[PDB]
Write a protein that binds this ligand. Structure first.
Ligand SMILES: OC[C@H]1O[C@@H](O)[C@H](O)[C@@H](O)[C@@H]1O[C@@H]1O[C@H](CO)[C@@H](O[C@@H]2O[C@H](CO[C@H]3OC[C@@H](O)[C@H](O)[C@H]3O)[C@@H](O)[C@H](O)[C@H]2O)[C@H](O)[C@H]1O
Ligand SMILES: [Mg+2]
Length: 339
């Protein structure tokens, strides 16, 4: 009976990621990492605005690597740990549902070499013991997501769910994450903990290999920017959404229903979105199809927002953070009013 997790999630309208922020990797071992990818320092106002528009859930991606002391303790620099807490507290201040993750650890130590399972597990666990100790007293609105797209960057199957050995490794790491949090007690005893597949991929072979913890307070996270060629810019990509590629969304979702939802396993899409390609009307329709699909079974999603819209780079930006104005109200409206 995993119903407690379902109840908790049902409280979310739709979520929002604080992209390219605490996840950013410049600035070395300092709080300036937050601004190293060109975003402004996150404020209470920014989070209020997100929550006010109707994203009552927020994902705070964070990359810890440069802020860790040497192994085996991997002590999180106190300055970084406290700023992370300040950002989570912005959301706590507004009664929001929250996901804290580890993020681009994949650039550093989180390289999915099955031969190196213990070292990987131990580091994940050492980080999450400290994070869990820091957020012990936070209520059940705050959730943890153990890893972000854990994979072997540069590998042939980096973005297609990796290899079998790799996926066994992901099970080991998911277990280590859960074990290390639960062992800290307090509100972490029953905190929703969000595990993931290899790369957060949702292809049948990836899901088929996913071990499901018997811990009843978990959810499974996936990323689906589906279809890739609509949402991303690339050779073969398109900007028109007429419905003809909805089967791509549908088909993938049937796998998630088969392996997760229909077995009573909570699922969350902790990232999705569509890069802006001067095509408001199409995104709006894609949203109807994409999110409407998720809505059939009460599945929630969090939208990736890197605050990039006019500039160059992947144009997932929605909230203009400096102006506290949305870059595109029509796209936003479709997301917040999806129900
Ligand atoms: O299904 C479309 C598939 O068709 C091929 O013919 C095509 O060439 C191929 O590119 C495409 O698969 C995508 O490949 C991209 C790189 O070529 C991947 O880009 C990455 O997407 C990431 C998101 O990752 C997760 O969600 C989507 C899911 O597809 C993936 O497996 C997950 O791990 C981004 O974070 C990253 O920036 C980007 O490079 C893309 O993910 C593949 O779908
Ligand atoms: Mg308790």
């Amino acid at each position: 009976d995993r119903s407690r997790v379902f109840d908790i999630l049902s409280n979310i309208n739709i979520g929002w990621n604080l992209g390219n922020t605490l996840d950013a990797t410049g600035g070395g071992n300092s709080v300036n990492a937050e601004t190293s990818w060109g975003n402004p320092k996150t404020t209470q106002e920014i989070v209020d605005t997100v929550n006010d528009r109707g994203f009552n859930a927020i994902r705070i991606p964070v990359t810890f690597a440069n802020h860790l002391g040497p192994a085996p303790e991997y002590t999180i620099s106190a300055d970084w740990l406290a700023r992370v807490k300040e950002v989570v507290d912005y959301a706590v201040n507004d009664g929001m549902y929250i996901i804290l993750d580890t993020h681009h650890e994949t650039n550093y130590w989180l390289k999915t070499d099955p031969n190196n399972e213990a070292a990987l597990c131990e580091e994940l666990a050492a980080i999450w013991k400290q994070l869990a100790e820091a957020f012990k007293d936070y209520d059940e609105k705050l959730m943890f997501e153990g890893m972000n797209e854990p994979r072997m960057a540069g590998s042939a199957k980096e973005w297609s769910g990796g290899t079998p050995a790799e996926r066994k490794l992901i099970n080991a790491m998911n277990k280590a994450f859960i074990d290390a949090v639960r062992a800290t007690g307090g509100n972490n005893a029953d905190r929703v903990l969000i595990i993931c597949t290899y790369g957060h991929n949702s292809d049948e072979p990836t899901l088929k290999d996913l071990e499901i913890p018997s811990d009843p307070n978990i959810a499974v996270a996936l990323h689906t920017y589906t279809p890739y060629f609509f949402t991303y810019v690339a050779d073969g990509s398109y900007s028109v959404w007429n419905g003809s590629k909805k089967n791509d969304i549908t088909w993938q979702y049937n796998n998630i229903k088969k392996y997760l939802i229909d077995k009573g396993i909570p699922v969350v899409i902790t990232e999705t979105g569509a890069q802006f390609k001067e095509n408001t009307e199409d995104i709006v329709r894609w949203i109807g199809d994409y999110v409407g699909t998720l809505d059939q079974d009460g599945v929630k999603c969090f939208i990736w927002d890197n605050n990039i819209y006019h500039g160059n780079g992947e144009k997932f930006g929605l909230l203009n953070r400096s102006l506290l104005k949305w870059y595109n109200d029509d796209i936003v409206d479709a997301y917040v009013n999806h129900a």
